[PDB]
């Protein structure tokens, strides 16, 4: 019965650490990889047209940046995603499928298909137990993309040049520039791959994802299962202020759902 509201406008930040290619070393003598770098992953979500009684469209801008740099520097990743979803089920109507940014109302202790926009497919978000988050009893879900349930790199996504985003899907450079073994001035072509793992903490009543943990791994390799050079390898978790903001938003949605449900009954 409940519907996703049309006034969603959120800005959520997840802090963590990464190993990443320094964008400013692109034309240097060697590709520079910075290790154990502090990062912040920011997600801006707003409602856009088409949105009506049946559907809601969300435009989501995601950026990853170094936090030991001022605002004009340390820019690592920047992605935009747009999805139209059913307001009652949160399922998608690039073509998306399943859940994308929210879980359904009255979320159950079961598996849900959860879209990964880089993999361009839904992967299972498996129920993993209950957990308290700031006084709210949440359901935990775990999703693996390119990793099998045992956490082993198994089917990482190979980037297409059409959807390579900010970095080339295929890169040719000297072994010396890549920093890998090779013959003198050997030329090596590597392809970029992607694998990720995420945990979601969900309010079962509103379906709001109040907290998330995300591990994203992008790397260059000649063979998918033998990574050679990291492009970005990050692990982030929703920060305390953003968790508080989502817990407050979920609580306000629960209060409105409760008011409407009680009015429909006696």
Residue numbers in the entry: 36 to 128, 155 to 327
Please, what does the article write about this entry?
NCgl2760, MSMEG_0317 and Rv0227c, which we collectively term LmcA, lack significant amino-acid sequence similarity to other proteins, making their function difficult to predict. Previously, we identified a new membrane protein, conserved in Corynebacterineae, that is required for synthesis of full-length LM and LAM.
To gain insight into the structure of MSMEG_0317, we focused on the periplasmic domain and produced a truncated form that lacks the predicted signal peptide and transmembrane domain, referred to as MSMEG_0317Δ (residues 30–323), using a M. smegmatis expression system. The N-terminal region folds back and interacts with the C-terminal α-helix located just before the transmembrane domain to form a closed structure that resembles the shape of a ‘cone with a flake’, with the cone being the β-barrel core and the extended α-helix being the flake. In our MSMEG_0317Δ crystal structure, the electron density of loop 9 is well resolved except for the side chains of Asp226 and Asp227. Loop 9 in this conformation is stabilized by a number of van der Waals interactions, including those of Tyr224 in loop 9 with Gln181 in β7 and of Ala228 in loop 9 with Tyr292 in β14, and a hydrogen-bond interaction between the main chain of Asp229 in loop 9 and the hydroxyl group of Tyr281 in β12.
